[PDB]
Amino acid sequence: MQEHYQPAAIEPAAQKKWDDARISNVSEDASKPKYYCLSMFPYPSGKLHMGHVRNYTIGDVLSRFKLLNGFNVMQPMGWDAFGMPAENAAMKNNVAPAAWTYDNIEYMKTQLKSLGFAVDWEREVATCKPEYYRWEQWLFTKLFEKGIVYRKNGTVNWDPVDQTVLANEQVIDGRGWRSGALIEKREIPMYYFKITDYAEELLNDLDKLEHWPEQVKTMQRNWIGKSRGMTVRFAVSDDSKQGLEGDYAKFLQVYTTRPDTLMGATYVAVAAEHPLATAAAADKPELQAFIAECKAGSVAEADMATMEKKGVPTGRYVVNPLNGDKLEVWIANYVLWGYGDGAVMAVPAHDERDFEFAAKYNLPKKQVIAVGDNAFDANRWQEWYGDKENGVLVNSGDLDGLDFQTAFDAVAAKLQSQGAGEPKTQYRLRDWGISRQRYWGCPIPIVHCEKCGNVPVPADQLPVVLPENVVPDGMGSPLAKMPEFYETSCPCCGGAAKRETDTMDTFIESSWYFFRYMSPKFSDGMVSAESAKYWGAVDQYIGGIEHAILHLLYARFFTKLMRDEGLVNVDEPFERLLTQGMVVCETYYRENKDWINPADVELPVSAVLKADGLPVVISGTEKMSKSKNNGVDPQELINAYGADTARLFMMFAAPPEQSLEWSDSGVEGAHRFLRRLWRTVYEYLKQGGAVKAFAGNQDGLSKELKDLRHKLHSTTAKVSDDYGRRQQFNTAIAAVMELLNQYDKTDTGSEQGRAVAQEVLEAAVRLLWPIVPHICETLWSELNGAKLWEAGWPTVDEAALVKSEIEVMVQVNGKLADLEAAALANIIVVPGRLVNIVV
Numbered sequence: 001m002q003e004h005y006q007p008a009a010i011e012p013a014a015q016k017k018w019d020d021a022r023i024s025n026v027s028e029d030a031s032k033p034k035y036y037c038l039s040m041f042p043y044p045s046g047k048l049h050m051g052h053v054r055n056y057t058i059g060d061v062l063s064r065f066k067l068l069n070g071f072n073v074m075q076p077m078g079w080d081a082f083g084m085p086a087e088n089a090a091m092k093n094n095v096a097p098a099a100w101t102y103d104n105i106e107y108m109k110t111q112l113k114s115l116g117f118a119v120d121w122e123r124e125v126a127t128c129k130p131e132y133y134r135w136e137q138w139l140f141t142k143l144f145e146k147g148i149v150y151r152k153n154g155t156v157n158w159d160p161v162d163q164t165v166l167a168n169e170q171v172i173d174g175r176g177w178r179s180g181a182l183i184e185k186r187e188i189p190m191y192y193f194k195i196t197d198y199a200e201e202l203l204n205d206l207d208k209l210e211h212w213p214e215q216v217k218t219m220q221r222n223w224i225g226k227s228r229g230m231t232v233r234f235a236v237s238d239d240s241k242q243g244l245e246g247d248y249a250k251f252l253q254v255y256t257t258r259p260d261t262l263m264g265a266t267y268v269a270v271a272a273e274h275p276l277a278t279a280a281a282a283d284k285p286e287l288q289a290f291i292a293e294c295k296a297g298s299v300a301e302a303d304m305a306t307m308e309k310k311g312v313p314t315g316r317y318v319v320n321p322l323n324g325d326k327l328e329v330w331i332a333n334y335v336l337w338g339y340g341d342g343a344v345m346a347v348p349a350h351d352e353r354d355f356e357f358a359a360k361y362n363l364p365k366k367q368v369i370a371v372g373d374n375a376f377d378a379n380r381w382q383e384w385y386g387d388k389e390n391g392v393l394v395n396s397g398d399l400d401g402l403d404f405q406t407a408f409d410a411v412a413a414k415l416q417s418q419g420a421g422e423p424k425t426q427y428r429l430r431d432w433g434i435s436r437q438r439y440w441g442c443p444i445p446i447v448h449c450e451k452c453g454n455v456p457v458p459a460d461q462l463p464v465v466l467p468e469n470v471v472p473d474g475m476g477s478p479l480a481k482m483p484e485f486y487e488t489s490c491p492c493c494g495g496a497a498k499r500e501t502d503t504m505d506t507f508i509e510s511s512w513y514f515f516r517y518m519s520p521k522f523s524d525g526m527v528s529a530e531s532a533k534y535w536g537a538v539d540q541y542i543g544g545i546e547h548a549i550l551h552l553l554y555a556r557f558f559t560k561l562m563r564d565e566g567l568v569n570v571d572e573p574f575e576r577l578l579t580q581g582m583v584v585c586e587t588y589y590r591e592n593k594d595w596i597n598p599a600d601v602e603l604p605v606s607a608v609l610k611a612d613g614l615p616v617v618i619s620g621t622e623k624m625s626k627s628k629n630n631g632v633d634p635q636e637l638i639n640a641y642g643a644d645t646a647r648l649f650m651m652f653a654a655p656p657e658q659s660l661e662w663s664d665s666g667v668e669g670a671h672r673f674l675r676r677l678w679r680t681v682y683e684y685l686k687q688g689g690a691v692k693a694f695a696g697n698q699d700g701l702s703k704e705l706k707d708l709r710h711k712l713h714s715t716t717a718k719v720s721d722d723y724g725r726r727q728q729f730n731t732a733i734a735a736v737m738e739l740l741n742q743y744d745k746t747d748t749g750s751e752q753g754r755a756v757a758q759e760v761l762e763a764a765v766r767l768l769w770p771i772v773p774h775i776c777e778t779l780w781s782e783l784n785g786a787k788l789w790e791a792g793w794p795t796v797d798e799a800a801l802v803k804s805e806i807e808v809m810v811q812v813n814g815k816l817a818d819l820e821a822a823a824l825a826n827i828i829v830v831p832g833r834l835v836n837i838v839v
């Protein structure tokens with residue numbers, strides 16, 4: 001055994017030992033309990049970053065833990081290859097996105113193999129290969145003829161300079177981020193997944209996810225946004241019907257989730273595209289400018305509540321069908337045309353948004369809800385104004401005294417009696433638009449024929465291969481400029497036809513890749529029936545919190561779609577979910593700001609550039625990114641200390657949910673502990689060699705060795721509970737360090753002492769194997785000759801936890817240090833089990 005810990009010597013040999021044994025290459029063996037541990041597969045951006053290393057180390061710790069407990073563990077890896085990154089690097093390097101993608105895949109695959117992740121590389125997938133996306137094109141065609149996928153016109157943001165479509169997140173003050181030109185709003189036909197049909201199922205099945213973070217389930221419920229409200233129709237006053245036609249001349253229909261406060265409505269608001277706004281603005285220039293300003297907006301839901309709400313009166317009036325109050329209609333900028341009826345009512349006394357809106361324009365506030373003896377200040381909002389559970393109605397006529405639910409049915413009864421309204425259920429969830437005007441993506445299997453219409457590609461002709469011999473210039477979608485691609489024949493009549501040049505949303509490939517891992521070479525479907533029946537669903541899922549809404553909701557949606565097609569048998573894809581925190585680092589620059597990467601900086605007084613001696617400016621600590629040039633390359637971390645030191649540093653610096661801060665001193669400490677672990681096993685084997693680990697009746701051991709066995713098996717139970725239940729790996733590392741400290745302070749020189757020392761070391765290297773498997777595999781082969789994965793997870797000897805009982809009999813006046821203070825708690829004693837009290 002080498003005296004000093006050398007990572008570059010043991011890590012390749014340990015990885016070769018694991019590959020030759022094929023411990024990670026698992027199949028559908030029905031003679032062993034399966035476990036599907038999955039980490040979110042990465043974009044082949046070029047090289048790994050610290051966020052990747054943390055995620056896949058967390059997944060490998062859990063996978064190796066289940067592996068040591070006898071599970072048939074599958075930990076697959078893959079590449080989310082489609083997207084704008086490859087298209088942007090194409091425009092900057094004059095290289096095809098496919099060639100740029102495949103080079104990154106082979107390089108990042110080399111890095112992942114260097115870290116020693118126990119993954120099944122025989123199940124590797126790449127979403128940009130036709131062997132993969134042929135099946136999402138297949139599901140598209142099946143759902144297209146079923147109506148789940150449909151095609152209709154949708155409004156997009158067009159940049160007339162960059163010649164591309166931009167999202168609302170890419171529109172600043174109505175202009176593009178790169179071009180800076182005023183964006184144009186055009187209606188173009190696009191494809192949609194009718195996800196609203198599964199809205200109630202996607203909402204209620206969240207309750208099954210008992211091992212999901214409650215904030216993630218809460219984030220999905222709010223995004224779905226189911227509300228059980230009331231449709232209310234306000235009769236248009238006879239003096240306000242000019243310019244209106246049809247039902248819009250009869251009434252103004254709104255939707256509200258608080259019909260118990262209908263008596264408190266002081267005004268109503270419509271959208272800019274509402275016919276009431278159109279008729280009222282026909283002769284008012286100030287309203288036409290307000291309607292044009294609303295239509296030219298681009299407020300995303302990530303900041304639609306931070307939008308400055310504003311409105312303008314119209315002069316038209318409607319009638320409240322429950323008290324006769326003549327209410328004026330306003331044009332508001334928060335009423336969205338397409339949500340409900342494009343019109344709402346406002347109760348400023350019990351809705352915080354209507355409160356601020358009314359206080360802005362000095363609009364009346366009518367209290368109709370009272371919660372106890374709480375005072376009502378009309379010039380100050382209080383949280384009890386919007387209470388529903390503990391409130392009764394006031395100033396509501398014959399509705400006073402009722403709570404929320406009874407007044408809900410009471411208002412519904414009156415509205416349905418006169419035909420002025422009825423209950424209704426709605427959802428904030430919109431349909432999923434999947435059309436993208438880019439090249440580097442999965443083609444949409446639709447052929448356009450002027451005789452047959454929008455026709456899906458037959459199953460025999462799939463896939464519609466995306467040509468990889470393309471270098472996008474940027475003046476539009478390259479597929480739209482390639483007649484060799486889109487010109488084809490119609491699959492129904494055989495005449496001249498054009499292919500769909502748009503590609504699919506890249507979230508589609510990540511919505512089902514967890515099923516493809518079960519049979520990534522199955523040529524007859526998305527997933528074979530025998531594999532999906534065996535592996536079932538994903539037991540453990542690890543990924544960042546940024547995907548807690550869209551990606552997870554899309555995966556649950558696709559799971560139910562595939563289930564209803566007889567492909568899979570599960571209702572949910574992910575049983576357990578672990579969201580990892582971000583990785584932050586300090587930033588440095590040199591003004592002239594010119595941010596410098598920390599790997600080239602040398603420092604507690606100040607810091608300076610490693611290339612010379614020019615002092616740098618230390619700035620704030622932020623998440624690692626290319627914005628402030630504070631990303632620390634993980635490859636340099638491996639080249640300096642080895643893979644085990646990197647894994648150990650990330651699992652010990654912070655719990656997985658908590659954000660990890662980069663620290664050069666912390667990396668040195670992790671490497672220093674690995675030296676200590678190596679030195680400990682070496683010094684033990686030098687003074688005698690390996691022996692048989694202690695086992696059996698511990699009675700007869702010294703008090704010192706009994707305490708070391710107590711600390712040992714309590715540490716095993718602590719680590720086992722930290723891996724299985726809490727999933728808090730930094731505390732498990734601390735527990736093993738505490739065991740080694742007591743080992744250092746224990747005389748293990750005797751024959752029975754060596755046996756306990758062997759039991760301590762054989763357990764410590766196995767408890768730390770899921771975290772640092774390279775050095776643990778090497779140290780285990782020096783202490784024991786058997787296979788580590790065949791020895792299994794260390795068992796807890798509960799006999800070593802039961803402490804010795806101090807039993808004796810007390811005696812006061814004849815009849816019935818350490819033992820005297822306990823007896824006096826309830827005069828010389830006998831050194832044994834007898835204490836006499838001379839009173």
Ligand SMILES: CC(C)C[C@H](N)C(=O)NS(=O)(=O)OC[C@H]1OC[C@@H](CCCn2cc(CNCc3ccccc3)nn2)[C@H](O)[C@@H]1O
Binds near residue numbers: 042
């Ligand atoms: C399931 C599927 C939807 C996943 C998808 N392929 C994906 O997110 N892949 S991934 O490679 O980003 O991360 C893959 C994994 O790594 C750990 C974590 C990173 C958190 C910090 N971070 C770093 C970064 C910069 N990279 C982002 C980037 C890169 C290139 C272009 C644009 C954006 N962002 N957040 C993740 O949540 C994810 O668990």
Ligand SMILES: [Mg+2]
Binds near residue numbers: 208
């Ligand atoms: Mg259950």
Ligand SMILES: [Zn+2]
Binds near residue numbers: 451452453492493494
């Ligand atoms: Zn045709």
